[PDB]
């Protein structure tokens, strides 16, 4: 519901971890960031081993709880949280001025951050956040 982002990043065909690392860096420097097209973000490797890892995180837990996100929405945001000292004041503040979106709720297109782009013509072993979520059982709302 309205987010005055100083920066709108487009995660389409972009390496999730590399984008996450730059968004964390900027958020810590005071920038308000909106990551768009999360379902289209990308992660390299064997789809079978990548999914096993995310499935293990979904299965982990107990009474204390290990709530792991399944939507590309939350997967990406958690990824960013792991690069932020979210339990510290400054860290929680940065994390809270960051938001990820399915599709692009803005009229302005996002920008592609340098070094985070994956070239589909040169790569075949990678998966999409959307694909992961579907496998995890998420409701493909996007």
């Amino acid at each position: 519901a309205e987010f005055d982002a100083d920066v709108i990043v487009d995660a389409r065909d972009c390496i999730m971890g590399r984008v996450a690392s730059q968004v964390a860096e900027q958020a810590l420097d005071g920038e308000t960031v909106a990551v768009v097209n999360a379902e289209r973000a990308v992660i390299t490797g064997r789809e079978e081993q990548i999914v096993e890892k995310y499935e293990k995180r979904v299965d982990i837990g107990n009474d204390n709880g290990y709530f792991y996100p399944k939507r590309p929405d939350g997967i990406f945001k958690r990824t960013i949280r792991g690069m932020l000292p979210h339990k510290k004041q400054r860290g929680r503040e940065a994390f809270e001025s960051v938001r990820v979106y399915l599709g692009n709720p803005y009229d302005e297109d996002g920008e592609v951050l340098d070094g985070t782009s994956l070239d589909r013509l040169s790569n075949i072993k990678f998966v999409t956040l959307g694909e992961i979520s579907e496998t995890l059982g998420a409701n493909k709302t996007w």
Binding site: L121, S122, N123, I124
Partner: protein, 172 residues
């Protein structure tokens, strides 16, 4: 490396992105040829498969892409056909085409009919104890043929004794 394939006069080959479409009097076939650093394109009256890489893995796919394209050429003109013979011993096997799937009844004396959906615009024509599978896309045709044979596969009993089923008789 680079390989050039002169497209047949009877054929027209258009292509956008990673998808290639081939059309002829016998129909059309579209395929996605996607592999790291292998560019496929239609340079006038010739289809080109090229890459700056030449390692075994790359060469493997290049040769693979070629055959796929040459097969598309062949399928849109001459077409692809597979012949099958329905053999059975004690129980009269009823093989029929219904809708977009081939149905088999009374297999080995079973009450429940066995069936499979035909792939693509593949055509299945049955004449007595003979079946012919044909179409422009060798993928859909070859599978449909195979599926029919698999459809009468038996794991439970000794095959040397129970041989009922439909088998691929001729391969294109």
């Amino acid at each position: 490396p680079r390989v050039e394939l002169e497209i047949p006069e009877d054929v027209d080959a258009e292509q956008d992105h990673l998808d290639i479409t081939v059309e002829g009097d016998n129909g059309s076939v579209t395929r996605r040829l996607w592999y790291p650093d292998i560019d496929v394109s239609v340079d006038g009256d010739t289809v080109v498969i090229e890459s700056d890489e030449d390692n075994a893995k790359t060469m493997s796919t290049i040769g693979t892409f070629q055959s796929h394209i040459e097969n598309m050429f062949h399928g849109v003109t001459e077409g692809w056909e597979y012949g099958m013979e329905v053999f059975y011993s004690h129980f009269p096997m009823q093989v029929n085409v219904e809708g977009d799937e081939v149905v088999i009844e009374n297999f080995l004396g079973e009450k429940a009919p066995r069936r499979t959906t035909i792939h693509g615009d593949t055509d299945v024509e049955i004449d007595g104890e003979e079946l012919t599978v044909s179409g422009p896309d060798i993928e859909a045709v070859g599978q449909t043929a195979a599926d029919i044979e698999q459809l009468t596969r038996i794991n439970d009993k000794d095959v040397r004794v129970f041989q009922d089923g439909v088998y691929i008789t001729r391969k294109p």
